[PDB]
């Protein structure tokens, strides 16, 4: 759907079908799994390919490659990372504990820090940050 995903898809398809056959055969796939540490049976890999092989080829190709990347990616951009930053640990409640931020500044051992930021990002002027004013912080 995008244009750099085609770039990474071509690079990974190059990585898998490493000999140059133009088709993912089972041996190169097991080579990739064994480089990742896994050595499963020779009957489960058959079922895995048979679900991914649509053409009846017993070998999957670039159209099928991007079909599986498409379904797994877009079925499940900046909402998630800024969201789950701290407020996404609270899940639509708008009240962040100060003790979480004290713990974060505790573990990473930072030399000098004063928490006046949370004092001066206070937009409800209560002592916590809702999510819209949390993005206003970011």
């Amino acid at each position: 759907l995008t244009d750099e995903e085609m770039d990474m898809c071509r690079k990974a398809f190059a990585m898998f079908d490493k000999d140059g056959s133009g088709t993912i055969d089972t041996k190169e796939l097991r080579t990739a799994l064994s480089a990742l540490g896994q050595n499963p049976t020779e009957e489960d890999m058959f079922v895995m390919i048979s679900q991914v092989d649509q053409d009846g080829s017993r070998c999957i190709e670039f159209k099928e490659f991007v079909r599986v990347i498409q379904i797994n990616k877009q079925m499940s951009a900046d909402t998630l990372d800024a969201f789950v930053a701290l407020g996404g640990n609270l899940d639509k409640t708008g009240r962040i504990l100060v003790d979480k931020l004290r713990s974060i500044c505790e573990e990473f051992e930072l030399t000098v820090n004063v928490d006046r930021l949370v004092k001066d990002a206070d937009r409800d002027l209560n002592g916590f940050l809702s999510y819209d004013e949390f993005r206003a912080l970011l």
Binding site: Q38, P40, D44, V47, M48, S50, Q51
Partner: protein, 140 residues
Amino acid sequence: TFDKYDFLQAAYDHFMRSLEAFEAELKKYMAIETEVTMINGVNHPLKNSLKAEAVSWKTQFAQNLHKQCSDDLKLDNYIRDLEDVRNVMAVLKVREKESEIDNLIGPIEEMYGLTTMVSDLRYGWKKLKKVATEVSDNLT
């Protein structure tokens, strides 16, 4: 989606909820087996352990039928061996229907659910003919 399978005598409780519905029970366990195989096509240590757990569960459920199969066998062995009223009372027994219920319970479990008592089951079947011969000699 692995957690939806978190599962041994609860099976006996399921049996306490109760003929071919038994076969339906074994087939819904078979359907759990086939969707596990589809997930094998999707996904293995965490998978092989529950695979072996299915190996545990259906074999033990087959054996908790097989024990009742043995009980059916022995209680049938029992009956294998003013008198005219007793002769008529045994002459009324539908008895072949009870032998057939036991035969259907056993052989379906052996074949479609896949001891030396198979020939004993055959001699169960022929037992009624032998008993009729004995009753014929008991006519006088």
